[PDB]
């Protein structure tokens with residue numbers, strides 16, 4: 001019902017999420033202000049697992065100064081036992097917002113799409129590739145989208161956003177993140193994932209790999225959006241659109 005971080009006393013409002021070792025809480029400070037505290041319990045965590053959390057914190061602290069589209073981290077407490085991260089509190093996650101919403105206004109969709117490329121572009125500049133991108137790594141705060149996960153540590157489980165190169169890499173580049181964002185935008189346009197209809201997961205993996213499989217892009221009034229979707233969802237990483245290219249596309253730029 002209460003926890004301390006760097007002397008500061010935060011009273012727990014509710015629990016948002018959990019990822020086994022982790023637990024996220026909606027808390028309030030002394031002045032009734034809202035924050036979200038991530039709690040990690042290192043008691044049973046391994047040497048490799050600890051450096052993944054040590055790495056994610058470092059980047060999440062550095063990269064905060066490089067984009068308003070990356071989740072704010074106000075403070076943190078690290079000991080051998082736990083990790084207390086005091087971050088900004090969002091309205092709702094993108095996955096929950098999309099699963100709820102029936103309609104998606106073109107002006108909102110385009111705005112969110114710009115927020116994502118800005119975050120994803122920031123991380124790529126510091127040599128980070130997320131790889132596992134899903135609407136859950138995004139969070140609506142002050143009507144603006146923000147990146148919570150850098151895909152470094154363990155996230156607090158849909159196969160609908162997997163890049164083809166990843167499935168074929170069983171025997172990862174920035175183009176892997178383009179495919180995944182392409183799938184989040186497609187689902188923001190057509191209401192469903194590109195391979196969301198393929199019930200069997202073994203077969204769903206067969207589809208993403210197979211080039212003789214044609215992905216559907218129904219005729220939309222937003223001409224540029226359909227071209228964005230056709231460029232992001234190119235199976236060959238070499239022939240796929242880049243993040244600096246998407247940022248200079250007519251979809252993002254033309255008003």
Ligand SMILES: Cn1cc(-c2c[nH]c(=O)c(N)c2)cn1
Pocket residue numbers: 016024036038071087088089090091093139148149156
């Ligand atoms: C890195 N990380 C940020 C969060 C988080 C921060 N703020 C929130 O509002 C939320 N739902 C989640 C969880 N993990």
